[PDB]
Design a protein around this ligand. Structure first.
Ligand SMILES: *[C@H](O)[C@H](C[C@@H]1CCNC1=O)NC(=O)[C@H](CC1CCCCC1)NC(=O)[C@@H](NC(=O)OCc1ccccc1)[C@@H](C)OC(C)(C)C
Ligand SMILES: *[C@H](O)[C@H](C[C@@H]1CCNC1=O)NC(=O)[C@H](CC1CCCCC1)NC(=O)[C@@H](NC(=O)OCc1ccccc1)[C@@H](C)OC(C)(C)C
Lengths: 301, 301
C-alpha cells in the first residue's frame, strides 16, 4: 500500500537525450533512430522561422550525444519542431510512438540540461493546456512521456514558460498544446479548472489505501453533481468519465455517482483539518489509469 | 521556475534490477558486478536465517535478468541482505556506492516487480526510520538511491510494510533502518515528527519561486523556535541545520532564523486557505540540497 506521485522509469528516454547547439542557444534534443527533434526556436535571429531556417546550414547545428559529436546531414521543420537528420542512428532508440494527449492526461517529464537528465516527475496536461512543470533556462527540448509495456509514447516537448510560472510546449510533431505560439510576445495561460475525473480517481486511490473518512451515504445525479462542480471551477464530468471510472468503482464497491456525492460534500465543506493520501488539497493529477497502475503493480519491459 | 517532487533519473538503476526466485517467493534483486543483492527473507521455511540458509543450495536461487537466467555460484548473508555470487558481471553496472543515510535525507525509489521497474518516486527517511512508500507484494528488493554526478549511491532496499501502511527496509549492507527486524512478529513504526530543516528548505524553494506571502518582519531565537517546534511535533533545529540552510538563506536574503519566524507563525495560525508551492500542508520531504539542485538545474552524467 501507499500512494505516491509516481513517474515512469526514465531510462529508455535518458538514452535518447542529446545537446543541440545553434548559435548562442543550447537546449535538449530527442535522438530517435537518425533524427534529433528539438524546438525550432533554437535557430538564429516576431520571428519568421521559414526565413530563419532557410538561412541555416547543417554545420550550424552542434549535436552532442555524450562525448560524441553527431553530424547533421539534413534538417526540416515540422510545425514548431526542428528535425535534424544525423548520420548515426541512436542504438538506444526504444520502441516509441508520438502521441498528442488530451487535457487531463498525465505524463512523466524528464527534465534535462545540456542533454543530461536532471530529474523526473509526473505532470498533467492542464485543462488550459499548460503544464505545471519545473523548468529552468536550458530545459527546452526536455520531453514528457508515458510508457506502455515496452513502448515509449512521447507526448510533450518543452518550449517556454509563461508569466504565471507554468509551462507551454508541443507534441513531438511540433503542434503546441493550447493557443500558444513560439514567439516572445505577450501570452497568458487562460483560467484553469480542476480535472474532476482525476479527483474521483484519487478518491478511489484513497479508499483502496484505507482512507474512507470522506465517504457518505448520499448519492447524486450527474446533472446535480456537475452543477456543483461548475460552481467550484471543476471540469464537467461526462458519462465517458463515469464509464472510465468503472473498474475503480467495481474494485471498491463505491458507485461512481456515490463518490461524486462525496466529492460534492468535500467541495462544500472542505476537509476540516483532515488529509487524504497525505494531501490537504483535492489532488487532480492522477488519472484513473494511474491509480489502477500504481495500486496493482503494472511494470514495463 | 516551478517546483516538483522530483526523482533522480532511474536508468542507471533500471539496468541493475533482476528477478530473484527461491521456493515460492519472488522478489527483486540488485545486480552490481557479479553479485545480486536481495532481502534475505527470500529464503525458505521467528525465522533463524543462519539455519535456513545453511540448508540452501545455489541452484535453489533462480535469478532472471531480462530473458537471461543467471547462474548462482555462491551465496552469503550480510546482516539482512543475501548476496548471490553469479557467474556473469552486470555490464550495465554503474559507478556506485552503498550509503547508510540519516533520517531526514531524501532518495528516489525505483519500484519494481519481477525485476521490472514499475515507477519512480521521491521519498524521505522519516525520523522514525520508516518511509512512506508505495509498495505492493513483490516489491521487496526495490532500492532507493541518490545520484551524484555519475555515481549511484544506493541507500535503501525494501523489505516489509508495517500496519500503518508505511515501509521498512535496510541499507544495502542489510542493516535495517530503525528498530525493525525481518520477522513477521508485531512491530510498529513509532511516533513520527516533521523534518524541520526540510520544511525550511521548502519555504526557501517557495520564495525562490515567487511565493512570499508567509514571510514576516519578525525574527526568533533558535531556542525560542525549538520551543514552538516541539509543541507541534517538529524535529529540533540544530545549528548544523541553520548552517546547512546557509546557501539558501544567502540566495534569498532571508536569514534562517527569519524563516524560522515565518514557520512559527505558519505553525501557530495555519495557512488560512492559502497554499505554498501547490501544497496546503507544510512539506518536509525536500532537503536543502534538493531545493538547490532543482532550483539551479544540476544534472548527472
Ligand atoms: C528553453 O530552454 C527556455 C525554457 C524556459 C526558461 C525559463 N523556464 C522555461 O521553461 N525557453 C525560453 O526561454 C523561451 C525562449 C523563446 C520561446 C519563444 C520563441 C523565442 C524563444 N522563452 C520563454 O519561455 C519566455 N516566455 C515568453 O516569452 O512567453 C510569452 C510572453 C512574452 C512576454 C510577456 C508575457 C508572455 C520566458 C523565459 O519569459 C518569462 C519567464 C518572462 C515569461
Ligand atoms: C516483499 O515483496 C513484501 C512487500 C510488502 C508486501 C505489501 N507491501 C509491502 O511493502 N514484504 C512482505 O510481504 C513481508 C515479508 C516478510 C518480512 C519479514 C520476514 C518474513 C517475510 N511482510 C510484510 O511486509 C508484512 N509486515 C509485517 O509482518 O510486519 C511485522 C508485523 C507483524 C504482525 C503484526 C504487525 C506487524 C506485511 C505484508 O503485513 C502487514 C501488511 C499486515 C503489516
Amino acid at each position: 500500500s501507499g500512494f505516491r506521485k509516481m513517474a515512469f522509469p526514465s531510462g529508455k528516454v535518458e538514452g535518447c537525450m542529446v545537446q543541440v547547439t545553434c548559435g548562442t542557444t543550447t537546449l535538449n534534443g530527442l535522438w530517435l533512430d537518425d533524427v534529433v527533434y528539438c524546438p525550432r526556436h533554437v535557430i538564429c535571429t516576431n520571428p519568421n522561422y521559414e526565413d530563419e531556417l532557410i538561412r541555416k546550414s547543417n554545420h550550424n547545428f552542434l549535436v552532442q550525444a555524450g562525448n560524441v559529436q553527431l553530424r547533421v546531414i539534413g534538417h526540416s521543420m515540422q510545425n514548431c519542431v526542428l528535425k535534424l537528420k544525423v548520420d548515426t542512428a541512436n542504438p538506444k532508440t526504444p520502441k516509441y510512438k508520438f502521441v498528442r494527449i488530451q487535457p487531463g492526461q498525465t505524463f512523466s517529464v524528464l527534465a534535462c540540461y545540456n542533454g543530461s537528465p536532471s530529474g523526473v516527475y509526473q505532470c498533467a496536461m492542464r485543462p488550459n493546456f499548460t503544464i505545471k512543470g519545473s523548468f529552468l533556462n536550458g530545459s527546452c527540448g526536455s520531453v514528457g512521456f508515458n510508457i506502455d509495456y515496452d513502448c515509449v509514447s512521447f507526448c510533450y516537448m518543452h518550449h517556454m514558460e509563461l508569466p504565471t510560472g507554468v509551462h507551454a510546449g508541443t507534441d513531438l510533431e511540433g503542434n503546441f498544446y493550447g493557443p500558444f505560439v513560439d514567439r516572445q510576445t505577450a501570452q497568458a495561460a487562460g483560467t484553469d479548472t480542476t480535472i474532476t475525473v482525476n479527483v474521483l480517481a484519487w478518491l478511489y486511490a484513497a479508499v483502496i489505501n484505507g482512507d474512507r473518512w470522506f465517504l457518505n451515504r448520499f448519492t447524486t445525479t450527474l446533472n446535480d453533481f456537475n452543477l456543483v462542480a461548475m460552481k467550484y471551477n471543476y471540469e464537467p464530468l461526462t458519462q465517458d468519465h463515469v464509464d472510465i471510472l468503472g473498474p475503480l468503482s467495481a474494485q471498491t464497491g463505491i458507485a461512481v455517482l456515490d463518490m461524486c456525492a462525496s466529492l460534492k460534500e468535500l467541495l462544500q465543506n472542505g476537509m476540516n483539518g483532515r488529509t487524504i493520501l497525505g494531501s490537504a488539497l483535492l489532488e487532480d493529477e492522477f488519472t484513473p489509469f494511474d491509480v489502477v497502475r500504481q495500486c496493482s503493480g503494472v511494470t514495463f519491459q
